[PDB]
């Protein structure tokens, strides 16, 4: 038993809710919240900009030190950093950005990072400003992640389309 509430169950291990991931994290304080990161951990907009704003820019300060030490992530890769006031940990995962021409096949590799964590609160990778089809992203999530994932979808219209079209 965990503290996630109001989710629709899609599969044995994947759950979905129309929710603002920032507000959901603030309430649940999950062990892991996933950020929709880029390779530079520049949290300017989308989910990343919203998560970072909710930490009063502490996420960005920590991220800049991480990059200065380690260099950029790979597309499809991840790193674990602090969850600040939102979660114990933040798993920064880089899905491919279609608006940069990155290979959508890397979306599966991105979701594989979730399997290193037993339970996660997450957005749909490569959705939103990353330019991928969220229905495809949901399919890859379900077919790749084996651990327990609670997906927060900000847009109500999109949430209803994802549910209604789910196979
Ligand atoms: O940035 C994108 O492209 C996204 F479409 C946005 N997303 C979100 N997913 C859940 N909660 C959210 N709260 C937010 C508050 C402000 C801005 C965005 C979000 C958001 C998902 C997304 C990250 C990859 C697709």
Instruction: Kindly state if the Cβ of 154 falls inside 6 Å of ligand 1.
Output: yes
The angle formed by the CA atoms of residues 155, 160 and 162, to the nearest 5 degrees, is 90
Atom of ligand 1 nearest to the CA of 22: 13
**How many A from CA of 62 to the centre of ligand 1?**
21
- Give the list of residues 6+ apart from residue 51 with CB closer than 8 angstroms, or none: 21, 22, 25, 33, 35, 43, 59, 86, 90
In a domain? residue 154: yes
Within a domain: 126? yes
CATH of the domain at 17: 3.40.220.10
Residue ranges making up the domain that contains 80: 8-165
> Please, what's the b/e burial string for 69-85 (b: 16 or more CB within 10 A of its CB; e: otherwise)?
eeeebebbbbbebebbe
Question: What is the resolution in angstroms?
Answer: 1.0
Q: Is 33 helix (H, G, I), strand (E, B) or coil?
A: strand
Ligand 1 centroid, distance to 37 Cα (angstroms)? 11
Domain membership flag for residue 142: yes
Q: What are phi and psi of 123, to 5 degrees?
A: -90, 170
Q: Is 4 in the pocket of ligand 1 (CB under 6 A)?
A: no
Tell me, yes or no, whether 105 lies in a domain.
Answer: yes
The answer to whether residue 33 sits within a structural domain is yes
3 lies in a domain? no
Task: Tell me the two tokens of residue 150.
Answer: 């609670």
Q: Is residue 44 part of a domain?
A: yes
2: in domain:
no
Which residues, including other chains, have CB under 8 Å from residue 143's CB and lie 6 or more apart? 108
User: How many structural domains is the chain composed of?
Assistant: 1
């Amino acid at each position: 038993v965990n503290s996630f509430s109001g989710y629709l169950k899609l599969t044995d291990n994947v759950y979905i809710k129309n929710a603002d991931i920032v507000e959901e994290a603030k309430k649940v304080k999950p062990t892991v919240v996933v950020n929709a990161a880029n390779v530079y951990l520049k949290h300017g907009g989308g989910v990343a900009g919203a998560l970072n704003k909710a930490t009063n820019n502490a996420m960005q300060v920590e991220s800049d030190d991480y990059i200065a030490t380690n260099g950029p992530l790979k597309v499809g890769g991840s790193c674990v950093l602090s969850g600040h006031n939102l979660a114990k940990h933040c798993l920064h995962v880089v899905g491919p950005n279609v608006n940069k021409g990155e290979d959508i096949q890397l979306l599966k590799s991105a979701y594989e990072n979730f399997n290193q964590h037993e339970v996660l609160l997450a957005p749909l990778l490569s959705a939103g400003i990353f330019g991928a089809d969220p229905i495809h992203s949901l399919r890859v999530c379900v077919d790749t992640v084996r651990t327990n994932v609670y997906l927060a979808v900000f847009d109500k219209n999109l949430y209803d389309k994802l549910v209604s079209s789910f196979l």
